[PDB]
RNA sequence: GUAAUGGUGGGGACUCAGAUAAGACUGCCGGUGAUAAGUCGGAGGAAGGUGAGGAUGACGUCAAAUCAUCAUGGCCCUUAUGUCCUGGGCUACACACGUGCUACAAUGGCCUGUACAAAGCGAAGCGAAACAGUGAUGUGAAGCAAAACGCAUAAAGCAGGUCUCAGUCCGGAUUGAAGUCUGAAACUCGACUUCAUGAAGUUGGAAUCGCUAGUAAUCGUAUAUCAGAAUGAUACGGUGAA
């Protein structure tokens with residue numbers, strides 16, 4: 002919920018990686034750590050594996066994912082649906 | 086420097102201090118450059134305050150001025166009561182016995198305590214619940 | 217254990233409307249939350265309403281008599297001798313008389329059904345004046361419960 | 374109420390856990406209707422076990438028992454027996470009429 | 471009012487040496503023959519700290535300390551260059567400190 | 573405390589939000605006091621011994 | 633005995649409060665509705681004629697979204713988060729607090745009765 | 747000075763601040779008590795029998811707590827159990843217990859006007875007057891290393907209007923949408939605001955806790971840690987009993 006005057010947050014390394022992917026026709030997967038990066042509308046339609054502390058969880062990004070954050074879709078703790 | 090105020094006194098309460106000035110007049114009361122009745126809105130506290138005068142049957146012939154600060158409304162009422170008592174004493178020795186009989190010369194040294202570590206308040210303690 | 221408690225304050229004989237200690241004590245028992253002004257206003261308005269529901273000039277008179285209609289005489293205090301608990305009757309003291317009375321009126325008025333503040337309490341006050349209602353019922357209940365168990369009256373230690 | 378078995382620096386074999394339960398059914402014929410809680414704390418500190426049993430009674434009495442031992446089974450036997458006996462003693466205190 | 475005044479504030483932890491320095495200064499200036507406004511006592515500043523006692527769990531038990539700062543004030547009328555120079559020249563026992571404004 | 577942690581606290585972080593104050597006498601990471609730049613236990617010990625000028629016991 | 637948006641208001645209720653019975657309406661926006669259709673908020677919801685209530689309904693489905701549509705896209709928003717398999721979506725799926733509250737001792741206003 | 751401000755010229759009178767002193771010691775009087783120690787009242791007095799509060803915690807006990815603040819004997823690892831960083835985690839749930847907050851509503855909720863405090867804090871910090879904005883806040887910089895200015899127009903209260911015993915104009919948890927501030931970053935895992943959403947909850951069984959007077963009870967304020975984030979903790983005052 003940042004101020005408007007700050008604009009969205011995207012890490013710089015991730016951002017020029019996104020530009021390089023944008024200028025490449027190959028749709029390579031991007032592995033990342035910056036879970037706090039906002040999905041800027043330009044980087045719609047990519048595939049990113051984000052590190053949840055154990056493994057790189059991959060996502061295809063669609064248009065409606067815009068405005069969220071990358072960590073929102075990489076679960077970090079698992080519950081087996083039962084407390085036993 | 087007229088010194089029209091024939092006598093002056095001071096009074097204290099919980100955390101309030103009042104300065105009292107006796108003048109000649111019909112008994113009007115001026116507090117903080119405001120009307121006495123409008124300032125002390127509670128008639129109970131006003132009777133509280135004017136009790137020394139009614140006991141010393143002197144109301145209506147001496148005007149009063151009060152400069153009071155600190156404390157709450159009740160504290161200020163008590164402070165001005167004490168100030169009136171001290172001013173009447175400073176005026177006349179005749180009222181000493183009756184004022185001391187009513188206890189108007191000994192002031193309420195009673196004050197709020199301090200909080201103590203390990204306590205929720207001055208005396209309240211945290212819940213034990215042993216079972 | 218170290219008896220003969222220090223002399224009570226007793227200095228609050230309310231110098232506001234009647235120069236009477238009993239009204240002050242009743243207002244104090246009325247208090248919630250530390251709100252003396254609210255209690256004083258409610259009590260004054262309610263006794264005024266009572267005095268004009270009974271249409272007399274002297275409000276002290278009717279208030280005092282409605283109190284004295286509830287002030288009890290003998291109450292039950294429990295002792296126990298030889299592993300046997302006995303509910304011995306004992307004569308109350310006057311201060312405890314006002315206390316029990318005021319407590320009973322206050323509890324009944326608060327727990328009654330009413331529209332408003334002085335409404336509830338004035339209604340209860342005239343019920344007491346007429347010797348009927350929850351407060352008078354409780355008083356007579358205590359009275360003749362103590363009387364129904366007067367056999368143990370020789371245990372007054 | 375039903376008893377609360379806590380442990381520190383140790384791991385509960387199911388054998389010893391239901392051993393504790395089997396020693397505790399002695400209460401639910403005589404004492405259960407008189408107590409608020411019954412806690413049993415096991416600790417393993419100096420190559421030995423330290424047991425603390427604790428009971429609260431409905432009339433304001435509190436019973437505590439602390440013991441040490443070497444073998445968990447023996448320690449539990451002795452400590453639970455002592456606890457049950459003291460609880461019976463307090464119940465009789467009060468019911469002596 | 472006054473053409474100018476020298477406002478000098480004396481700060482200390484210790485009342486005794488603070489006072490001692492106060493009369494030292496007042497004597498030093500009356501030697502220079504200047505009119506003086508009285509050494510006027512400012513409110514003492516008390517900073518209370520509450521700390522735990524045990525190095526571990528015990529929380530209900532603690533201990534309280536203060537830092538106390540005592541402050542006096544001197545006003546000097548009709549500032550003189552020699553007077554200000556002498557005030558700056560004065561040596562002073564440790565524990566009492568001076569602040570000067572023209 | 574851990575001397576390496578003391579030294580890293582002393583050094584300059586990537587930004588101040590990365591650095592936390594420590595009692596540089598004992599390196600305790602917390603219980604810190606800014607007025608004295610040291611932890612509650614060091615403060616208590618040395619103030620009790622009188623090594624901290626101006627700090628005496630408080631009667632309230 | 634007027635009906636607005638399918639909800640007909642209790643006539644005994646002070647109308648500025650009566651409109652709050654309409655879903656999507658709270659105290660404040662009821663206040664704008666009153667002072668925006670130019671009806672005294674103190675007037676009861678019984679003494680109301682027909683032209684002015686046509687005015688109120690004009691206001692209501694002119695400037696506001698009310699129970700039907702409001703329910704519609706609140707359910708739409710929930711399902712949009714829920715199908716997209718986000719943290720909040722699967723949280724809605726399970727029935728557990730969303731904003732990050734304790735979910736071990738004090739989460740059973742969402743978890744339900746024990 | 748028309749304000750709002752002792753604001754201005756003035757003034758030591760008062761409060762006040764803080765140094766130095768006096769004062770309360772059963773001192774005195776009566777009764778009682780073994781001519782005692784003591785004891786119950788009385789006078790004087792602001793203070794009477796330790797005035798009130800705090801500090802001050804004997805020999806020892808529980809092999810009570812702490813090697814995880816430090817110090818330390820022995821044992822243990824030495825590209826490791828050490829250390830630099832990225833991310834996760836300490837915030838995980840069918841559950842059980844302990845400590846608090848807010849309530850369940852009429853000694854009340856909401857709307858408008860008005861009144862009275864103390865103790866604290868400010869240097870990368872306080873940040874005013876005003877304007878924009880329903881609001882969180884934003885632009886600006888006066889003044890200030892501060893009994894000089896700022897935080898900061900305290901809240902219960904009082905004077906009016908409204909609500910009518912209704913799961914309610916009570917309750918504000920829960921969620922949806924859009925915002926505010928902090929910092930490089932706040933999705934898991936920050937606080938706050940606006941709008942809607944309006945659940946459990948009808949004073950709570952056995953059982954149990956706190957409190958003898960400015961005390962319980964309640965209402966706000968300040969501080970410590972802190973870039974940011976308290977219902978906890980520390981401290982301050984208002985009303986004020988039984």
Ligand SMILES: [Zn+2]
Pocket residue numbers: 595597598599600610611612613614615815
């Ligand atoms: Zn330290």
